[PDB]
Write a protein that binds this ligand. Sequence first.
Ligand SMILES: NC(=O)c1ccc[n+]([C@@H]2O[C@H](COP(=O)([O-])OP(=O)(O)OC[C@H]3O[C@@H](n4cnc5c(N)ncnc54)[C@H](O)[C@@H]3O)[C@@H](O)[C@H]2O)c1
Ligand SMILES: NC(=O)c1ccc[n+]([C@@H]2O[C@H](COP(=O)([O-])OP(=O)(O)OC[C@H]3O[C@@H](n4cnc5c(N)ncnc54)[C@H](O)[C@@H]3O)[C@@H](O)[C@H]2O)c1
Lengths: 302, 302
Amino acid sequence: SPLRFDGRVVLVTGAGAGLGRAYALAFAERGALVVVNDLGGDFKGVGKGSLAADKVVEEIRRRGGKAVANYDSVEEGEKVVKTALDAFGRIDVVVNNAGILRDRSFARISDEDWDIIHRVHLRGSFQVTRAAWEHMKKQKYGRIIMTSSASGIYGNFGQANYSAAKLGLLGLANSLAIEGRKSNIHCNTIAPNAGSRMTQTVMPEDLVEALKPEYVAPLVLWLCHESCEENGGLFEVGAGWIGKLRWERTLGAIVRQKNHPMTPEAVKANWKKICDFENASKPQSIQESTGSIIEVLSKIDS
Amino acid sequence: SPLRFDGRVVLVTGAGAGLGRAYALAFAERGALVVVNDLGGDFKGVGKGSLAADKVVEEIRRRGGKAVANYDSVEEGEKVVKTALDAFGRIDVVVNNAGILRDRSFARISDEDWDIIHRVHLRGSFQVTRAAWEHMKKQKYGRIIMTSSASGIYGNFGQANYSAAKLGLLGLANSLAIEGRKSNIHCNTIAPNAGSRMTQTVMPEDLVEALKPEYVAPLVLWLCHESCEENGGLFEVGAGWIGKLRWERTLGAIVRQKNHPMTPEAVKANWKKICDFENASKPQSIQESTGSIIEVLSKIDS
Ligand SMILES: NC(=O)c1ccc[n+]([C@@H]2O[C@H](COP(=O)([O-])OP(=O)(O)OC[C@H]3O[C@@H](n4cnc5c(N)ncnc54)[C@H](O)[C@@H]3O)[C@@H](O)[C@H]2O)c1
Ligand SMILES: NC(=O)c1ccc[n+]([C@@H]2O[C@H](COP(=O)([O-])OP(=O)(O)OC[C@H]3O[C@@H](n4cnc5c(N)ncnc54)[C@H](O)[C@@H]3O)[C@@H](O)[C@H]2O)c1
């Protein structure tokens, strides 16, 4: 049976171009009432305009879908979610996608370069999501997506500001998944790969064209569907492929011995064992890691 | 041979109490010229005083080490680093440890709760580290620690603000590791467990006493030593135990077929495969993930 969104209010931030545009179209085609948010500025965080969101709303309506435009920056997240409440009377799905770039080597990152990346990516997603949250709890339904990146997950030369903001988003998502669960609110995180104005600088023209944002949209739609049970997952996605990430944790070493001072010399001596991933565990929660560490105290005293 | 720090200028932020105090004392005992930074306020980010830093400087001096105090907030990271430059003429090791808590359910996190946590933890470590960076590069020597948390790595109810900031720090560490490497500048991240004023609220009294910050200091000193080769690692640590964390990534599923639109139905139908961690890879860099995703384009065309 086809996965539909009839009667679901779906907000996509940064929906004027690239991935967000692809999301907004794909949702509206499946019957979603779509809020198309876009500030309408450039990819470095300069400017503002109605045109970017208005062009997408028009496209959606031409294709026989339902959509309204929002022109506020995600920094004003309350105002963004207000459009959903005014136009459609509810908010069911939030796709946090809005983003910009300020690439620079570390010493060269200005205060402004840091703050603008963090206000848009991380604080922006927070603002938007907090605005939707109590509505989702009262309804007992929500589906939220955070947009991280490979540069956050792995690190990347010249992108310390951006990678900090992007992995911060994952940190946010880890906690939302926990707080939303009992209320049927899910939060999941994606690390997408797509040709766009943002990636034009780093990719050859033929790659930009080939790595289509419509290769990411099907994942977003699934993770945002009522029938989806995935919660608190992190996904890498592009080209038509999808994979999932998780932490693994070494068995490690108990370096401290009863009645003896723990020294950095014992850490150094035990370094290979500390870093050995053979039979690594797959920790599921804070309780699990925190609990096993605390039980180390009694193991030493035994 | 004992691991010494004679002639190394070591800055510890938030060194007035808890883990930072334990690091400062441990460093100074091994000959380090220590800058003891502390704002001297409470654990929720209220207040300011010279007492916190002064106490620790005098304890170090009483034990026969060398130390000077700095009283600025890490928000003023240039001023904190300037103390090392003024007192000792260089900066060699930076332990970003300063932090506060603003626990609250998600809907209840105010703008001020968010901004203060992010200013201190994330923007603070950035300001401090950015101030040291060019000095480290010209010297061709640096050792940096970021302090994350299990709540950032796993998520935790009522800590969405903090967990965002704490995993943002890891994101920052991932990129610094890459940028610093060729200059003998290492950055590593720890997720510690220690009894302190911060953890008194969630742990019983006997546990606070048992989970000593002195069990974490030996890892920090090793990771900050000149003979340490570890760079870009993430470690969980407490009770006398240490472990290391890494990402694993499913082989995943190519769900797009040549000449057929990619659908959310095909994502759904392949969900088990996408989520299956059997023979999961262990991705080491952005190149590795990005490269293999791009390669999927030609695989579909073939
Ligand atoms: N494209 C990739 O390969 C890639 C990789 C990793 C992460 N990302 C992330 O995915 C998201 C989508 O990016 P894209 O590649 O489609 O870039 P894009 O520039 O094509 O589109 C981003 C959209 O966000 C909008 N935006 C920027 N600031 C805004 C603000 N304050 N308020 C509202 N809208 C704002 C832009 O106007 C634009 O419409 C971004 O968060 C980006 O950082 C993309
Ligand atoms: N104790 C744990 O189990 C645990 C777990 C995870 C993370 N952490 C992190 O470890 C670090 C230290 O934790 P702790 O348990 O020792 O806490 P603590 O409160 O005992 O010590 C924190 C110190 O940081 C200082 N500080 C706060 N804001 C500052 C600022 N703006 N500038 C300079 N100093 C400032 C405080 O004055 C205090 O002395 C924090 O980043 C904390 O978030 C601790």
